[PDB]
Design a protein around this ligand. Structure first.
Ligand code: CDL
Ligand code: GGD
Ligand code: BCL
Ligand code: BCL
Ligand code: BPH
Ligand code: BPH
Ligand code: U10
Ligand code: PC1
Ligand code: SPO
Ligand code: LDA
Ligand code: LDA
Ligand code: LDA
Ligand code: FE
Lengths: 240, 302, 281
């Protein structure tokens, strides 16, 4: 009967759809590798899909995936066991070396652009006439780390222009230089901004940006990685 | 306690954003509406602009006429009494023609005619709105995924009010316009077809409805969990994978042994959701036209 | 085997129990103390389900059903073949789910990400516990819980619903359903919007979040924005499940009559109860 035919057909369709979805989801990170970076013997039952190409706006070229995968950065970890499946120990300072939860990806060293080809994220002082429109304005507040010491003072908010949102706080340190802190990693209070992720002595080590009025995707990844890494790696200097 | 990025701590505002031009007829955009600081704690504060245009006017007019046809019928049922209108608001119902009228438009106004008129306005409102989801994407040079997804919802709506009644040979098979009465119709529909729990397309529709809540909870939480690395900037993560997309993928890989990509999760999403009404519409269309009783059908497996 | 970008994240640390003892992977899966716990609970529960099947006399997945103790047992223990296995399997399931959530927490810690996902999952666990634990306890018997069987659990849904008339009339159930339908609407729209921008008309450059905002503003006059839509999907899904749990925890406890009759409170408000005309006059 027609209903039996429909349901039988549907299950065949569904199996095909899952195969499509799973292979689409193999456009990044595959082929799977051994811990030494060579191709793994067992790739599983799904093959890689035929490549697709994204045309990027503003002359930025294209992305074709799947494509050759490479980290494009040194990774300062080493094996802790003689067989596969165990953790890899940082060989240096994992916050400085950008591994574990301090990891960053070698994204393009250019800023994300809006639909008009301008820098998506700008310090609020350079964004006409962006302003704080609700909530406690954090500009001017002292910035406290998880050791409960003051690490600096907020001197601006970096804003996403097309999306009208706060993305970073720019914090001036004791030496007069500044660093960016992800808005998602700070708590704005009445009298301070508190940063649980970092003790005050780690603020200097936040990766710096090369130009003082823009931030590239690479730099954002280094900064966001470093700050989040502090939850694990500054745990000793934190602090009931 | 750590900030969880469910509500924003600080809102910022700049000049009203008038949007991308591309091929849009700017003469048809309104001005911006008010900014809402309240909305701004959770999402964007900006209201408007909205695109009008003649197809838009047609949809709005037709949709308002549907609503007002039902509402005027409700006032009539209330004996034009405001207190009774509010008291019995959920009990009023605009009902389709009796079975005797078949598919004719010969039913008197108070006995099905007004339901046909309301339904005609709804048909025009929804289909002209569908055209709009297509044309607004086209004008911006975007893919047509929204129009395709909307068509899956339209499929169930069309099956319920139009295709199934036509195949059954009477408008009396369609859904009444009323809050309680449409729930009564739904219960009755299951009882009369031998319990929809036995309809495998109903079971599938449920799997996708629950699965949509599972998947949006997973994806919403994942993106918030990696918002500290810019995770919600999904388009640029697709174009240039970052530590947000990698940590998202590895959370799921380490948890359940496989994972998505920033682009591909949105394909899981669109399909999980659209399959709710695709399977649902099939299940309903087969009911009474091909299968009179799902329990009985399931005993034969076919 | 590892994803091409995976090794740099596989560092030690983040465990809640056991230090480095269980800090390792099996293939793609992270283990951890709670990986071992989930395995134990899941294995035991599955073994006990297999034993229940043997006592029931079937291996057919569509027939196996583990029933809770009959109502006469109240909140006491019951013989294994007469509800006791359900009781133990329920402890196992709860252990397995809570262990799963806590293993997710360990994974979040190692990855340096927010705890949103296991927090969200906890809502599903609380809905499950509402049905098998909180509601049965409030009502005074394990037998009010649902049986573990593919088809028999649907029998329970139907029997339970119709105990209170048409269950559609439960107002918390109406709100839950509105959240489930709105969630699927939002999920379809979110998936479509991102895909429509990433996969534009042939030969065109990827669109931007600016075009995503513009599309929605053009269409409905408002865009919730790229952060807002993920907050919204999370809220709609968790609200759907919160109101689901709520609609059941009140049913059989605070309200136990026909749900349709609850609505008489509105109809009977003194200022219009007696006015002639309409449906209710
Ligand atoms: C009956 C129910 C009634 C149906 C009513 C409504 C149905 C609505 C369908 C919902 C579609 C949402 C998905 C959107 C999508 O990705 O497609 C984009 C695609 C267009 O892309 P775009 O957004 O304009 O441009 C962006 C890019 O250029 C290109 O964008 P892109 O890369 O995202 O799109 C590429 C796309 C190509 O686009 C399509 O054509 C999509 C087609 C849709 C379907 C199918 C419906 C299935 C229903 C279940 C039937 C089972 C029977 C019971 O490839 C797919 O997504 C498709 C594949 C998955 C199916 C594979 C399956 C299983 C086969 C079988 C089993 C085999 C072995 C198992 C053993 O949509 C379509 O053209 C099809 C829509 C229908 C139009 C009909 C009018 C023309 C006649
Ligand atoms: C919904 C639809 C979901 C679609 C499924 C997609 C699966 C994608 C797999 C793709 C491959 C992939 O890259 O992901 C992997 C494996 O996935 C799972 O194992 C986990 C599989 C988990 C999925 C379970 C599904 C549950 C069914 C639910 C009901 C819904 C059904 C719908 C109809 C990665 O797995 C690695 O790559 C290989 C994949 O075949 C290989 O398995 C290898 O070998 C491991 O060596 C270990 C030795 O100590 C061993 O102990 C371990 O168990 C092995 O996995 C792994 O390192
Ligand atoms: C006693 C009741 C019966 C029952 C009878 C029905 C019937 C009858 C139907 C369902 C259907 C469904 N049932 Mg059932 N169902 C039962 C028990 C359940 C249970 C449970 C017990 O836990 C669950 C979870 C469900 C779940 C579901 C869904 C999976 C499915 C509807 C999907 C949907 O998104 O529709 C919501 C989406 C739509 C209706 C699409 C709307 C489309 C657009 C075009 C709307 C236009 C609106 C516009 C003009 C108004 C604008 C106003 C705005 C403010 C602008 N049912 C019992 C057995 N069920 C439907 C189905 O598909 O069945 C197979 C269906 O017809
Ligand atoms: C005739 C039947 C009655 C009816 C009777 C009832 C009854 C009775 C109940 C509902 C409940 C629901 N009904 Mg009703 N309802 C009916 C009509 C409908 C209709 C409709 C369109 O007509 C709809 C849309 C709904 C929808 C709803 C939802 C609000 C709610 C179900 C979701 C939920 O609780 O999730 C919550 C999610 C869970 C419980 C899932 C938890 C799972 C987790 C923790 C773990 C599982 C993992 C594991 C086993 C995985 C295996 C391993 C593999 C690797 C995968 N009902 C009719 C009128 N309804 C239920 C409810 O609210 O429950 C709280 C409920 O008990
Ligand atoms: C994949 C299935 C899921 C789904 C998907 C879906 N729905 C869709 C779409 C998609 C992808 C859209 O693109 C389309 C949309 O535009 O969403 C924003 C839509 C949509 N789904 C909608 C509703 C809806 N979807 C439903 C469900 C679902 N939709 C499924 C769960 C339901 C349920 C669950 O019952 C409802 C009620 C609308 C929000 C929208 C279709 C809008 C439409 O067709 O409008 C026509 C009518 C009008 C233009 C006017 C309406 C009349 C009003 C009642 C009167 C008052 C409002 C008026 C507009 C105010 C203006 C006053 C002025 C004079 C100032
Ligand atoms: C709260 C919103 C929605 C939600 C959220 C949610 N669910 C989640 C998550 C989140 C955020 C996860 O992180 C976790 C996950 O890893 O997903 C991939 C999960 C998950 N939700 C799942 C299922 C699920 N979620 C459901 C729904 C929902 N989940 C809600 C609608 C449903 C429904 C609606 O029926 C199901 C079936 C799993 C895919 C996964 C949790 C996996 C897990 O806990 O694994 C550990 C345990 C085992 C491997 C098996 C244990 C076996 C038991 C010991 C015995 C079986 C007892 C059982 C009670 C029998 C039931 C028989 C049925 C026929 C009734
Ligand atoms: C943007 O980011 C995002 C991603 O990435 C970029 C993602 O991947 C995902 C994840 C989403 C997907 C991959 C989409 C598909 C997923 C669904 C449709 C949800 C439903 C998923 C399933 C049904 C699969 C369930 C599989 C499970 C639960 C694994 C089963 C494992 C066992 C047998 C349990 C036994 C014990 C274990 C594994 C504990 C460990 C102990 C030992 C190994 C010993 C999301 C949400 C996301 O937003
Ligand atoms: C289906 C739902 C769609 C909503 C229908 C929106 C109709 C509102 C039309 C208002 C109008 O015509 O212009 C008045 C204008 C004021 O006049 P004006 O802005 O047009 O005047 C200037 C015009 N020019 C520059 C051309 C001279 O106000 C607005 O633009 C307000 C739009 C905000 C509407 C927000 C509704 C959002 C709710 C929807 C989200 C939920 C999902 C649905
Ligand atoms: C205060 O008073 C005011 C002025 C505001 C007016 C008050 C308004 C009120 C109270 C209105 C309330 C409206 C309500 C309660 C509406 C509820 C609608 C519901 C619950 C609908 C549910 C399902 C509807 C479906 C499935 C409809 C399907 C319809 C179609 C597919 C259209 C089919 C087309 C037909 C039959 C026309 C055929 C003719 C041609 C030429 C195509
Ligand atoms: C986007 C695709 C996701 C696939 C989810 C498939 C879940 C299948 C659920 C089984 C339902 C079986 N039944 C009894 C309804 O026929
Ligand atoms: C406690 C309920 C018993 C569950 C049995 C194990 C699940 C097996 C999956 C069902 C497969 C359906 N199938 C393939 C037989 O048709
Ligand atoms: C009318 C469409 C909106 C859907 C929401 C469902 C309405 C149910 C409201 C019940 C709440 C009554 N209560 C608790 C305030 O008294
Ligand atoms: Fe997303």
């Amino acid at each position: 009967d027609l209903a039996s035919l429909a349901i039988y057909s549907f299950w065949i369709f569904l199996a095909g759809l899952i195969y499509y979805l799973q292979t689409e989801n193999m456009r990044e990170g595959y082929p799977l590798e051994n811990e030494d970076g060579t191709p793994a013997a067992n790739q599983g039952p799904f093959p890689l899909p035929k490549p697709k190409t994204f045309i990027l706006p503003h002359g930025r070229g294209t992305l074709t995936v799947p494509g050759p995968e490479s980290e494009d950065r040194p990774i300062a970890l080493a094996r802790t066991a003689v067989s596969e499946g165990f953790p890899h120990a940082p060989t240096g300072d994992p916050m400085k070396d950008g591994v574990g939860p301090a990891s960053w990806v070698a994204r393009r060293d250019l800023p994300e652009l809006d639909g008009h080809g301008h820098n998506k994220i700008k310090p609020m002082k350079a964004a006409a006439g962006f302003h704080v429109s609700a909530g406690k304005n954090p500009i001017g507040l002292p910035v406290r780390g998880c050791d409960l010491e003051i690490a600096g003072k907020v001197v601006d908010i970096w804003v996403d222009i097309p999306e009208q949102m706060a993305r970073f706080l720019e914090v001036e340190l004791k030496d007069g230089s500044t660093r960016l802190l992800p808005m998602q990693m700070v708590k704005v209070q009445s009298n301070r901004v508190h940063v649980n992720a970092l003790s005050s002595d780690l603020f200097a080590g936040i990766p710096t940006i090369k130009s003082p009025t823009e931030v590239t995707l690479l730099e954002e990844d280094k900064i966001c990685g470093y700050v989040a890494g502090g939850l694990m790696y500054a745990a000793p200097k934190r602090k009931s | 306690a750590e900030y969880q990025n469910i509500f924003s701590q600080v809102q910022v505002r700049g000049p009203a954003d008038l949007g991308m031009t591309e091929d849009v007829n700017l003469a048809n955009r309104s001005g911006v509406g008010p900014f809402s600081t309240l909305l701004g704690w959770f999402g964007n504060a900006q209201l408007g602009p909205i695109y009008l245009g003649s197809l838009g006017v047609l949809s709005l007019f037709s949709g308002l006429m549907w609503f007002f046809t039902i509402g005027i019928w409700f006032w009539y049922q209330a004996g034009w009494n405001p207190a009774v209108f509010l008291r019995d608001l959920f009990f009023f119902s605009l009902e389709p023609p009796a079975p005797e009228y078949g598919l004719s438009f010969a039913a008197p106004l108070k006995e099905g005619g007004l339901w046909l008129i309301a339904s005609f306005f709804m048909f025009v409102a929804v289909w002209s709105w569908w055209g709009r989801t297509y044309l607004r994407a086209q004008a911006l040079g975007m893919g047509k995924h929204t129009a395709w997804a909307f068509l899956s919802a339209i499929w169930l709506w069309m099956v319920l009010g139009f295709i199934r009644p036509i195949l059954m040979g009477s408008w009396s098979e369609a859904v009444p316009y009323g809050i309680f009465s449409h729930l009564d119709w739904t219960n009755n529909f299951s009882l009369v077809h031998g319990n929809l729990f036995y309809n495998p397309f109903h079971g599938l529709s449920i799997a996708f409805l629950y699965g949509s809540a599972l998947l949006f909870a997973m994806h919403g939480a994942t993106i918030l969990a990696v918002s500290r690395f810019g995770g919600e900037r999904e388009l640029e993560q697709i174009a240039d994978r970052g530590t947000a997309a990698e940590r998202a993928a590895l959370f799921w890989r380490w948890t359940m042994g496989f994972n998505a990509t920033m682009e591909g999760i949105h394909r899981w999403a669109i399909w999980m959701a659209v399959l709710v009404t695709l399977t649902g519409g099939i299940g309903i269309l087969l009911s009474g036209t091909v299968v009179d009783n799902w329990y009985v059908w399931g005993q034969n497996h076919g | 085997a590892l994803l091409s970008f995976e090794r740099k994240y596989r560092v030690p640390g983040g465990t809640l129990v056991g230090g480095n003892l269980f800090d390792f992977w099996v293939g793609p899966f992270y283990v951890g103390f709670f990986g071992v716990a989930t395995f134990f609970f899941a294995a035991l529960g599955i073994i006990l389900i297999a034993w229940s099947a043997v006592l029931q006399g079937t291996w057919n997945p569509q027939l196996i059903s583990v029933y809770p103790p009959a109502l006469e047992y109240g909140l006491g223990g019951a013989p294994l073949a007469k509800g006791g296995l359900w009781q133990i399997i329920t402890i196992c399931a709860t252990g397995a789910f809570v262990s799963w959530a806590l293993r997710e927490v360990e994974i979040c810690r190692k990855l340096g990400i927010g705890y949103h996902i296991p927090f969200a999952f906890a809502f599903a666990i609380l809905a499950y516990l509402t049905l098998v634990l909180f509601r049965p306890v409030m009502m005074g018997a394990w037998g009010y819980a649902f049986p573990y069987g593919i088809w028999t659990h649907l029998d329970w849904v139907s029997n339970t619903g119709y105990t209170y008339g048409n269950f559609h009339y439960n107002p918390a159930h109406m709100i839950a359903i509105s959240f489930f339908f709105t969630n699927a609407l939002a999920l379809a729209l979110h998936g479509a919007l991102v895909l429509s921008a990433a996969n534009p008309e042939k030969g065109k450059e990827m669109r931007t979040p600016d075009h995503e905002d513009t599309f929605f503003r053009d269409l409905v006059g408002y865009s919730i924005g790229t952060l807002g839509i993920h907050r919204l999907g999370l809220l709609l899904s968790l609200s759907a499940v919160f109101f689901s749990a709520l609609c059941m925890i009140i049913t059989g406890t605070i309200w136990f009559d026909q749900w349709v009759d609850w609505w008489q409170w509105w109809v009977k408000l003194p200022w219009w109860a007696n006015i002639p005309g309409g449906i209710n006059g």
